């Protein structure tokens, strides 16, 4: 009779259930594929395009005189590019390495173009540019993802710029970490908290933007506060509103003297415009199907319309052509299902097959340097992505 | 340009990360795969089977005459059939439907065949014998879970029945709930805890066992406390120890005499004997190689042993021919999670099958059937299996 097993334990160190979540929620690869019920119908690309909804704000930006009021606008457009996350909660898909994504907005003046750079860490490299060229906008974001009691908190890392081409200036910040309530069980619900600092390198003007946290009762539920100083650290106008909602402008003293005076969703009250305030921003109202379509903006249905004359001119690895994304648009969710199985296992199995073969991954429209503004490594994009000419593009789809 | 998307969204209801987390952790079918890395290299049959490890307190209970005696002896059963759980916090292979687990220990004078009768809820049927025919010791479980905080809770559903049969007497009850902390993120460790009844349905002698949760400060961690009071309600016996540990008894009057007087591991003492008191039971201690195998006890050791000899008369469907989990117990880890990944295919392949087939499934060697001595619906072993003459068993592994 044996007294012993023929082989002793393997050692698991620090894996975790959180492990396997780690993986899944987020952008890492995982062995296990996250099932498409969890999913919204948009690669997580996509989702990031949505930082471009309120493109006007930069033209609005270029258009002006003063660098104040120029910040302004800057400090507007920072806010309204994290502004659609209220309610999704739907998962965006995992890209796979070396998808793309762009979008043309003749309409709103700007194209965009996006690529899964690496899994090593998730990074996901995006590139947008004014029509007209008064601007570019670019960055780079690793979702991390840490687990704190009932929630998830996914910080968005990487640098991101915003210059205005006929100022000769450059601003850089950093997004604000996203929350994600009642991960495990509940209704799911979203925050955005962190202080984020916008840079004029031209002026040295900086912009304070403080989101912040929910606060024990809730009474700061999705505010921003915050003020625009100069080069000698003198403040010069008060910012406050609601990521949710609005931003609005007031002189520093205005805003002082008003100023005296399972986890659930805390009731958040639209917030008083102090009187002699300038309106920066507000929010674009959700459409009546939106509740119906994973509670998405107009914009974001636009983001994977494809049709027969885009399917001429789009690489091969445009997430228009995604199947299971198409799968689940469309309502197929099985086929959905099928589809990104069979996707997430060609990746696996490429990426052996660069393995045994020695060969290393070649990002196509990004490359790695130093951000020329602040010295942090970056993705910058390599130019030559609209020229279509795609040649020997990677084989991602089935 | 599109204002909607081509299909409205799908309305999932109440799924949840947990639901997922649950039909993993536990023994419900589930599309996604428990990564072998959380498995220990037994199935949930052979797990259960780990209540027969003290069988010789059954023995020892058949061969007295004082009912009295008896009851405490089945209660240190009961106490020591649930003992071997403490740092056992690999979770034991999914059975898959139809699997089936014998085992023979001669030196401890029983057998046991258990089977896998269903998914729907997930349901492990078990039918021990003394192999002089002095007791019939059956149940079958349904381990229910549920979420708490950073813990799971597995209730064990299903009625325990021990029939001393030169007696004429059966004892049934049901077995504490089980509790896992840290579930998501730390250190896993497991607790036991409820309200267990033995009743003896010849004489009306009931046992009452008080599993103790912990309680703050974790005083209690571990402790089991009751008595065993007869037809008229008189209490007779104290029984008091620690699962982890002991159970023994002493006259109700000495035991009161004496009573006047991420989630860490509380530090537990082994409790005093008070003077007078009766040894009923103690745990084995864990062999030196325990904690690198699993933490099994000597007994989990043997379960999962296989020779040519056995491979003989053991029906296909027997968990020793696992393929894998015994390359899980080999130290062959990606030839396990492969062959896990191809049976559990082969699983769901076979059952859409029947589906279509429009066939139900046949358990082979347990039918339900009303527990004959409290009425409730259960799992009878319905004989023949040890005759072998196997004919037309499932065809389950690869
Ligand atoms: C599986 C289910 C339960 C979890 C769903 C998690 C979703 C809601 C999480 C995972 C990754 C997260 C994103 C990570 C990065 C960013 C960039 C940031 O500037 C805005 C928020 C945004 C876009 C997050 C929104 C919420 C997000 C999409
Ligand atoms: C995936 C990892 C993190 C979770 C591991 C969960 C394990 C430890 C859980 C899942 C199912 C549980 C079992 C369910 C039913 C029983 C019968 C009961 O009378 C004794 C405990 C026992 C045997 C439980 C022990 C712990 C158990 C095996």
Known sequence: ????????????????????????????LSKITMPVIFNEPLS?????TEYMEHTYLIHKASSLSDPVERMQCVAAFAVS???????????????????????????????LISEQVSHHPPISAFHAEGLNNDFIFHGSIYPKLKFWGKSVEAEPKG???????????????????????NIIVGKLWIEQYGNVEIINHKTGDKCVLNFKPCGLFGKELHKVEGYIQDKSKKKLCALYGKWTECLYSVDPATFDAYKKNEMPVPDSESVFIIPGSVLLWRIAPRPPNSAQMYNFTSFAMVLNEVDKDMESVIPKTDCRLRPDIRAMENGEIDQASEEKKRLEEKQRAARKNRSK?????????????????????????????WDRNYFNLPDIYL
């Open 44 to 48: 997580f690309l996509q989702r990031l």
């Open 357 to 385: 073969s020695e060969e290393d991954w070649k990002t196509r429209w990004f490359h790695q340097g130093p951000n020329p503004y602040n010295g942090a490594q970056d993705w910058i994009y390599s130019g030559s992505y």
């Open 159 to 181: 640098t991101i710029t915003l210059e205005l081409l006929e100022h000769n200036e450059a601003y850089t910040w950093t997004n604000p970490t996203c929350c994600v309530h």
């Open 81 to 111: 590019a994290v502004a659609s996350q209220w309610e999704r909660t739907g998962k965006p898909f995992n890209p796979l390495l070396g998808e793309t994504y762009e979008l043309v907005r003749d309409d709103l003046g700007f194209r």
């Open 1 to 28: 009779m044996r007294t012993s097993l023929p082989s002793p334990m393997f050692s698991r160190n620090d894996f975790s259930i959180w492990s396997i979540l780690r993986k899944c929620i987020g952008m890492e």
